[model samples]
Target: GSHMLRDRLAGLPRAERTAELVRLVRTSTATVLGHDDPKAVRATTPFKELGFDSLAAVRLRNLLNAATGLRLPSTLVFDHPNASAVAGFLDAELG
Candidate 1:
């Protein structure tokens, strides 16, 4: 079987990639939270305050890994705590 490839956003420069990843995290977080507006999910807001639990954390991790072609751990939300942090982690990982 063919191997899965990294996402196109991974090819971007660090600053650009971080911004894109922030958007990706916000969008994916909205999906997990069932929000009609991703913008309502602020990058600085903690996932716990946004009603995320272990299950939602795992779900978000799965969503991000599938979308970014990265092997994100199940404790993604807990580790990163928020969209900005998650984007920073992703930027480092992509680097």
Candidate 2:
């Protein structure tokens, strides 16, 4: 339920966009991973490597799409793999 963030990044601070995006991914990933603490989702851990499945992929993709206004594919997790990578992907597309 913590997926699909809204448009809150407009004119985002000019500092640490990548880090902020990584935090967003950590939160969303925690939800999908069924963890009460987002901190459990490591920044460097890959999705599938971290037990993320197809449903989680769809969820994360939808989350990023809504937040970033991009139509992320359902295979987003498989493609991006990790929080840092996912954040980097978003920072590139929506930054």
Candidate 3:
């Protein structure tokens, strides 16, 4: 298998990395919500309001863990609450 968990995003600038994480969250959120449009996701939108349950939170956590090569908490959405907050958490972790 070609899949390897590496922190390729480690060198990205702060704002750029944050933007990337926000994008990831939005797209992943769309997937968990069974929506096709990532653009419909707002950075400030709460995962709870987006119809997230424990399963959806775990799904998003798994997706981000793979994407960022980080062992993120399963209570990801509970702690972060929204896309922007999650991006901040990613920034802090990657930094």
Candidate 4:
């Protein structure tokens, strides 16, 4: 499901890609962090609250980099801390 979202976002325009990224982040967080709904995950949600520690952050960074072709910092997800923030960061960086 996450891979499919990444693939779909890859072909979209910047604005659309950002939107898809939000969806991807929400879904990914829900699956990874065991949130019942994607909306439960937000930009301000702490990594610890999401059940993420350094190890999980590293793993997620590797997965995202592989999926997105972007060499993200291992802590990038934590730094942004939410789908929306990550999407916004990617939009700026990719642009």
Top candidate (TM-score): 3
Q: Residues 1-95, candidate 3: write the lDDT tens digits.
A: 12322444454556667888889888887788787797778999899999878988888888877557789877878998788998887777777
lDDT string, candidate 1, 5-95, tens digits: 2543455556666787888888888888777588577898798987788888878888888556889767778888788998877776666
Cα lDDT for residue 23, candidate 3: 90
In order of listing, the candidates' clash counts read 0, 1, 0, 0
* Highest lDDT model number: 3
Q: How accurate is candidate 1 locally (lDDT)?
A: 0.77
- Model 2 alpha-carbon drift over 4 Å, by segment: 1-15
Write down the TM-score of every candidate. 0.79, 0.74, 0.81, 0.65
| C-alpha RMSD in Å of predicted model 1 compared with the true structure | 7.5
Give per-model CA RMSD.
Answer: 7.5, 7.9, 7.4, 6.9
Candidate order by TM-score, decreasing, is: 3, 1, 2, 4
lDDT of 2 by residue, 1-95 (tens): 12322333454453456777788788877767676587566898888966667777777788777657888667668778678788877877775
The 10-residue segment of model 4 with minimum total lDDT is: 59-68
Between candidates 1 and 2, the TM-score winner: 1
What TM-score would you give candidate 1 relative to the actual structure?
A: 0.79
Runs in model 4 deviating more than 4 A are: 1-11, 34-40
